[PDB]
Scaffold this active site. Sequence first.
Site, PDB file in Angstrom:
ATOM      1  N   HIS B 119      -6.721  -9.730  -0.424  1.00 37.46           N
ATOM      2  CA  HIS B 119      -6.369  -8.526  -1.154  1.00 37.46           C
ATOM      3  C   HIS B 119      -4.871  -8.385  -1.268  1.00 37.46           C
ATOM      4  O   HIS B 119      -4.348  -8.340  -2.381  1.00 37.46           O
ATOM      5  CB  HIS B 119      -6.919  -7.245  -0.506  1.00 37.46           C
ATOM      6  CG  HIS B 119      -6.666  -6.010  -1.327  1.00 37.46           C
ATOM      7  ND1 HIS B 119      -7.647  -5.416  -2.091  1.00 37.46           N
ATOM      8  CD2 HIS B 119      -5.541  -5.283  -1.539  1.00 37.46           C
ATOM      9  CE1 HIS B 119      -7.142  -4.383  -2.735  1.00 37.46           C
ATOM     10  NE2 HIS B 119      -5.855  -4.279  -2.426  1.00 37.46           N
ATOM     11  N   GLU B 120      -4.210  -8.242  -0.114  1.00 45.65           N
ATOM     12  CA  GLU B 120      -2.758  -8.052  -0.022  1.00 45.65           C
ATOM     13  C   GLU B 120      -1.928  -9.063  -0.763  1.00 45.65           C
ATOM     14  O   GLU B 120      -0.903  -8.683  -1.301  1.00 45.65           O
ATOM     15  CB  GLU B 120      -2.249  -7.997   1.428  1.00 45.65           C
ATOM     16  CG  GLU B 120      -3.065  -7.164   2.392  1.00 45.65           C
ATOM     17  CD  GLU B 120      -3.469  -5.810   1.842  1.00 45.65           C
ATOM     18  OE1 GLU B 120      -2.638  -5.074   1.263  1.00 45.65           O
ATOM     19  OE2 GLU B 120      -4.645  -5.468   2.006  1.00 45.65           O
ATOM     20  N   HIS B 123      -1.174  -8.792  -4.332  1.00 46.88           N
ATOM     21  CA  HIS B 123      -0.112  -7.818  -4.513  1.00 46.88           C
ATOM     22  C   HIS B 123       1.198  -8.554  -4.483  1.00 46.88           C
ATOM     23  O   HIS B 123       1.999  -8.403  -5.411  1.00 46.88           O
ATOM     24  CB  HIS B 123      -0.120  -6.762  -3.396  1.00 46.88           C
ATOM     25  CG  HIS B 123      -1.094  -5.662  -3.628  1.00 46.88           C
ATOM     26  ND1 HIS B 123      -1.295  -5.129  -4.876  1.00 46.88           N
ATOM     27  CD2 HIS B 123      -2.000  -5.077  -2.820  1.00 46.88           C
ATOM     28  CE1 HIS B 123      -2.294  -4.276  -4.841  1.00 46.88           C
ATOM     29  NE2 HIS B 123      -2.751  -4.229  -3.598  1.00 46.88           N
ATOM     30  N   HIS B 129      -4.449  -2.694  -8.238  1.00 47.46           N
ATOM     31  CA  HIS B 129      -5.873  -2.500  -8.052  1.00 47.46           C
ATOM     32  C   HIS B 129      -6.675  -2.560  -9.290  1.00 47.46           C
ATOM     33  O   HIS B 129      -6.335  -1.938 -10.305  1.00 47.46           O
ATOM     34  CB  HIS B 129      -6.152  -1.169  -7.419  1.00 47.46           C
ATOM     35  CG  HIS B 129      -5.554  -1.013  -6.067  1.00 47.46           C
ATOM     36  ND1 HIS B 129      -4.899   0.137  -5.699  1.00 47.46           N
ATOM     37  CD2 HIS B 129      -5.581  -1.805  -4.969  1.00 47.46           C
ATOM     38  CE1 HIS B 129      -4.555   0.060  -4.427  1.00 47.46           C
ATOM     39  NE2 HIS B 129      -4.965  -1.111  -3.953  1.00 47.46           N
TER      40      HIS B 129
HETATM   41  C1  LIG Z   1     -12.349   0.897   5.306  1.00 49.23           C
HETATM   42  N1  LIG Z   1     -11.003   1.245   4.841  1.00 49.23           N
HETATM   43  C2  LIG Z   1     -10.631   1.107   3.556  1.00 49.23           C
HETATM   44  O1  LIG Z   1     -11.384   0.661   2.681  1.00 49.23           O
HETATM   45  C3  LIG Z   1      -9.195   1.578   3.197  1.00 49.23           C
HETATM   46  C4  LIG Z   1      -9.291   2.974   2.476  1.00 49.23           C
HETATM   47  C5  LIG Z   1      -7.919   3.579   2.520  1.00 49.23           C
HETATM   48  C6  LIG Z   1      -6.987   3.179   1.591  1.00 49.23           C
HETATM   49  C7  LIG Z   1      -5.680   3.649   1.679  1.00 49.23           C
HETATM   50  C8  LIG Z   1      -5.324   4.519   2.692  1.00 49.23           C
HETATM   51  O2  LIG Z   1      -4.010   4.987   2.779  1.00 49.23           O
HETATM   52  C9  LIG Z   1      -3.258   4.619   1.580  1.00 49.23           C
HETATM   53  C10 LIG Z   1      -6.271   4.933   3.614  1.00 49.23           C
HETATM   54  C11 LIG Z   1      -7.563   4.467   3.524  1.00 49.23           C
HETATM   55  N2  LIG Z   1      -8.471   0.587   2.299  1.00 49.23           N
HETATM   56  C12 LIG Z   1      -7.522  -0.335   2.661  1.00 49.23           C
HETATM   57  O3  LIG Z   1      -7.149  -0.477   3.752  1.00 49.23           O
HETATM   58  C13 LIG Z   1      -6.905  -1.194   1.531  1.00 49.23           C
HETATM   59  C14 LIG Z   1      -5.370  -0.915   1.510  1.00 49.23           C
HETATM   60  C15 LIG Z   1      -4.620  -1.491   0.245  1.00 49.23           C
HETATM   61  O4  LIG Z   1      -4.828  -1.053  -0.926  1.00 49.23           O
HETATM   62  N3  LIG Z   1      -3.743  -2.457   0.492  1.00 49.23           N
HETATM   63  O5  LIG Z   1      -2.960  -3.096  -0.663  1.00 49.23           O
HETATM   64  C16 LIG Z   1      -7.136  -2.701   1.798  1.00 49.23           C
HETATM   65  C17 LIG Z   1      -8.555  -3.235   1.410  1.00 49.23           C
HETATM   66  C18 LIG Z   1      -8.882  -3.035  -0.065  1.00 49.23           C
HETATM   67  C19 LIG Z   1      -8.636  -4.711   1.732  1.00 49.23           C
HETATM   68 ZN   LIG Z   2      -4.196  -2.586  -2.126  1.00 51.12          ZN
END
Ligand SMILES: CNC(=O)[C@H](Cc1ccc(OC)cc1)NC(=O)[C@@H](CC(=O)NO)CC(C)C
Ligand SMILES: [Zn+2]
Lengths: 367, 367
Positions: B119-120, B123, B129
Amino acid sequence: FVLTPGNPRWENTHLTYRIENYTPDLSREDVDRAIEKAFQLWSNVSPLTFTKVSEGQADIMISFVRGDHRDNSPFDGPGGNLAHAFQPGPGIGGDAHFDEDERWTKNFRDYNLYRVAAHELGHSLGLSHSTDIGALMYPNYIYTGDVQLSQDDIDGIQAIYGPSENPVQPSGPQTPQVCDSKLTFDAITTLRGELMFFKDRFYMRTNSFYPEVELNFISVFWPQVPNGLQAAYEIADRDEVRFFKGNKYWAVRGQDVLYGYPKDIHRSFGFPSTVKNIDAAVFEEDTGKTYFFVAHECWRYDEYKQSMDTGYPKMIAEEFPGIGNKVDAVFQKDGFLYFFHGTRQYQFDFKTKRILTLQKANSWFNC
Amino acid sequence: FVLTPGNPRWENTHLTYRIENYTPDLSREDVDRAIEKAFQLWSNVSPLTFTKVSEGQADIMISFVRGDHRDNSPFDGPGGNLAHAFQPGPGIGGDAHFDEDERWTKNFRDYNLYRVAAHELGHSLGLSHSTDIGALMYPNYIYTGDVQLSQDDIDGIQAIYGPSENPVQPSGPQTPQVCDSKLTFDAITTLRGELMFFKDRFYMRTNSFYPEVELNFISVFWPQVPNGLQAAYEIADRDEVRFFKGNKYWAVRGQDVLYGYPKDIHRSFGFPSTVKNIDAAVFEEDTGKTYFFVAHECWRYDEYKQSMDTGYPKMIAEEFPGIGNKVDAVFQKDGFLYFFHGTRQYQFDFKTKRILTLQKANSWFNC
Ligand SMILES: CNC(=O)[C@H](Cc1ccc(OC)cc1)NC(=O)[C@@H](CC(=O)NO)CC(C)C
Ligand SMILES: [Zn+2]
Ligand SMILES: CNC(=O)[C@H](Cc1ccc(OC)cc1)NC(=O)[C@@H](CC(=O)NO)CC(C)C
Ligand SMILES: [Ca+2]
Ligand SMILES: [Ca+2]
Ligand SMILES: [Ca+2]
Ligand SMILES: [Ca+2]
Ligand SMILES: [Ca+2]
Ligand SMILES: [Ca+2]
Ligand SMILES: [Ca+2]
Ligand SMILES: [Ca+2]
Ligand SMILES: [Zn+2]
Ligand SMILES: [Zn+2]
Ligand SMILES: [Zn+2]
């Protein structure tokens, strides 16, 4: 615990509530119990009573929604944001909305409705997020095998509505306090250069370079490992760790439990029937023997063969001089053995059979 | 897919990268492969090459951190926010930080490092996204049993760096398009008043009151159920559903697979060895018989007993007149049977043995 700013609390302690709509993920009755059980746990420890209705308004309207549903907080689809609720007040106050894009489940599987409903309700009643990792009012979803209130959720709600509801006043699990000087341990194993301290549902990880201990659930760390461990030891060369509860033990090789491993201590180790459980255990890597501690008896075990050395239910008092009549937990670090009992630990020199220093149980905790 | 505003892209396509620090959750080699595999999938489909280093700077510095680590984005402890990365640029650009308060795993267990690293990186290379539920660049963690790029992640990265890296140009799974008129189905079962349409890794849920179809993973809905289903049918009175792939089938009673159920179609149903897989199936609730479709053969099965009715490898052409030589998927709704083949479906009157209308495969899709 943290109380919501402005201190919103429901002026009367009996409330109505209503499930405006049901999720096709679960039968109606299954959605009916996730909710009452969620409500139930807040009752057991305070004076709140709740009547479910099926028509007209109620104080806590509960709906399954998704996306933009018109409240200036739209959901985000599958995952991430699961649900939300509103503090005590008229109209929308007390209301809880759950994201329907989530697969609502009845088990450990991702997004147990019961687990989420208990969170949101503490809000509906006036509570905010706790920094307590073990509290249901912590901010992130962590499902652990049940859904029970810790001592923190309890103190928060009784701080708004006072106690009661089981006038044999309820008690809830208190999350370990690393520096609290009255803290004692269940088990402790050194584990690949770090030390894993065990207590109830929690592990306290430290040592190798840690700017403080890491507190979290045993079950977030490992698959099968029970809560309430009694002893835990390590065999480094076999890159292996063992955990003990009652008359059973799990062996783990890095991250997961070995093949068909919740097994018997009596079958695997050769213990008398009288041995209903153990107290601590340590693989003495110099001699190649593990010592098991049972009440005030030290057993030595030829690990390399399963030969319980000649008889061996010995007196700890004669085996390890000066430590006492029982042990809480023990490990071997820097060659020394660290024997635990209550809040005091003894640095033992295995080679000269004498305690070198006495320290606190928390000394490794950067306290 | 969505490209990051201002279009940050690395001006040269070969980059260095370096794992500044490792997580005690996994051995070094296990942390070494989550990363290269993560990098690997972006290579296979574009011209990006990557050299791992162990000293000095590199374009993509990768660290495991926690809390406030001084970049105006502090982590949040266990769960929730797992990781984050920065767009192409000098200094911090391209850098990825993972939250150490997470239990980093090597399997399906919560917070697979490989899944997060893929994922990261998208970026770090210039991507944002995707709204595609099946894309690794979707915003929330959804682990599905592997970590593969869908067609969306591929088009996004090739939209910045053009194609290549397997000059037998790579193809990645395209997430079903509900209204795309060239869409066909793998299987379809009516399921408690809704219809469950199956296709590859995805299910398309609808009917009972839905303001559009719900697209998501088969594996987020059910435990054992494979991807690539071939047929799926329901037995309402037994509150039961069955799925078929190759020569095996799972039975499910509300939310989970029945006891020891991935079983044999030949053992359980009485099929010739020639029967390597089925094409569709429907429990005709009026007569109490299920019809299995195999190439151009309709088998009738006395569900209540397992009596494959007298011989029965019959000609679909004589059994269900006018539909053809093969079936994609079929169900029974409002008494009618809906026979599928490609993009056209036939409304069949089982009682008069004649097609009433011809409609599109997507007619139920609110399209
Ligand atoms: C089970 N947890 C989740 O699905 C959380 C939900 C969340 C997102 C943002 C947040 O604070 C901004 C708090 C919670 N997602 C994440 O960790 C994503 C952060 C991100 O987009 N990295 O580029 C990474 C995943 C898609 C591999
Ligand atoms: Zn992300
Ligand atoms: C696996 N997912 C999660 O842990 C997400 C992380 C997250 C949080 C907020 C968010 O957008 C604000 C996006 C993602 N937490 C949530 O859903 C919590 C929302 C909340 O606090 N309700 O009162 C509910 C849990 C604690 C039962
Ligand atoms: Ca209200
Ligand atoms: Ca969501
Ligand atoms: Ca749902
Ligand atoms: Ca003990
Ligand atoms: Ca950089
Ligand atoms: Ca986190
Ligand atoms: Ca960690
Ligand atoms: Ca088929
Ligand atoms: Zn809402
Ligand atoms: Zn909350
Ligand atoms: Zn950061």
